From a paper:
In meiosis, ploidy reduction is driven by a complex series of DNA breakage and recombination events between homologous chromosomes, orchestrated by meiotic HORMA domain proteins (HORMADs). Meiotic HORMADs possess a central chromatin binding region (CBR) whose architecture varies across eukaryotic groups. Here, we determine high-resolution crystal structures of the meiotic HORMAD CBR from two diverged aquatic Holozoa, Schistosoma mansoni and Patiria miniata, which reveal tightly associated plant homeodomain (PHD) and winged helix-turn-helix (wHTH) domains. Our data reveal how meiotic HORMADs with PHD–wHTH CBRs can bind chromatin and potentially discriminate between chromatin states to drive meiotic recombination to specific chromosomal regions.
To determine these proteins’ structures and mechanisms of chromatin binding, we expressed and purified the Hop1 CBRs of two diverged aquatic Holozoa: Schistosoma mansoni (blood fluke) and P. miniata (star fish). We crystallized and determined high-resolution x-ray crystal structures of both proteins using single-wavelength anomalous diffraction (SAD) methods with the anomalous diffraction of endogenously bound Zn2+ ions. The structures show CBRs with PHD and wHTH domain tightly packed on one another in an overall configuration similar to that of the budding yeast Hop1 CBR, but lacking the HTH-C extension seen in that protein. Within the CBR, the N-terminal PHD shows two highly conserved zinc coordination sites, one with three cysteines and one histidine (S. mansoni Hop1 residues C284, C286, H306, and C309) and the second with four cysteines (S. mansoni Hop1 C298, C301, C324, and C327). The S. mansoni and P. miniata Hop1 CBRs are 43% identical at the amino acid level, and are nearly identical in structure, with an overall Cɑ root mean squared displacement (r.m.s.d.) of 1.4 Å over 136 residues. Structure-similarity searches using DALI and Foldseek revealed that the S. mansoni and P. miniata Hop1 CBR wHTH domains are more structurally similar to canonical DNA binding wHTH domains than to the budding yeast Hop1 CBR, which binds DNA in a noncanonical manner. We detected DNA binding by both S. mansoni and P. miniata Hop1 CBRs (Kd = 16 μM for both). Mutation of arginine residues in each protein’s predicted DNA binding surface (R389 and R407 for S. mansoni; R463, R477, and R463 for P. miniata) to alanine resulted in a complete loss of DNA binding. Overall, these data show that in contrast to budding yeast Hop1 CBRs, S. mansoni and P. miniata Hop1 CBRs bind DNA via a canonical wHTH-DNA binding interface. We were unable to perform the same analysis with the S. mansoni Hop1 CBR because of poor solubility of the aromatic cage mutant (W304A; not shown).
Numbering used by the authors: 280 to 430
The structure:
């Protein structure tokens, strides 16, 4: 059993999806999948989509938004998706909590925290210094559909 995911953190968290091409697991949210019903019949990771494109013509589905990005741009997108999903299940966050939860370095977590402020997902002081409260309804009803809609 192996996790191999372009967020760069090769550890199970949340809903995991199996690539039909390499038999490694990715975080569903990294691949733009939040609801279990949006898990494809045959998931294809970003590596297999480029090594074996026939997988995509014979029933497989990749996340076309990250497939051809650079390593660094893809990692930043996937990690931000993970932090959005974390916020869906929490009342407040901080860089340190983000770092622990996602398995990443503090400085990277702080960048994700800062982007949450810009996307207006967090606002208002939490109980502890450095924490901000999640705008729960705004996240669920408005922000999340910007990133995770399948229509
Ligand atoms: Zn991931
Ligand atoms: Zn694969």
């Amino acid at each position: 059993y192996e996790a191999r995911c372009p967020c760069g953190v090769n550890k199970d968290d949340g809903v995991m999806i199996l690539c039909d091409g390499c038999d490694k697991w990715q975080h569903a949210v990294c691949f733009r999948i939040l609801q279990e019903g949006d898990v494809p019949t045959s998931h294809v990771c970003e590596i297999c989509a480029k090594l074996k494109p026939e997988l995509l013509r014979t029933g497989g589905t990749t996340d076309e938004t990250i497939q051809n990005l650079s390593v660094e741009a893809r990692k930043a997108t996937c990690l931000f998706r993970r932090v959005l999903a974390l916020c869906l299940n929490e009342d407040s966050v901080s860089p340190a909590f983000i770092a622990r939860s996602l398995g990443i370095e503090y400085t990277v977590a702080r960048g994700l925290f800062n982007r949450l402020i810009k996307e207006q997902v967090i606002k208002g002081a939490g109980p502890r210094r450095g924490e901000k409260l999640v705008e729960k309804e705004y996240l669920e009803n408005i922000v999340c559909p910007r990133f995770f809609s399948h229509n």
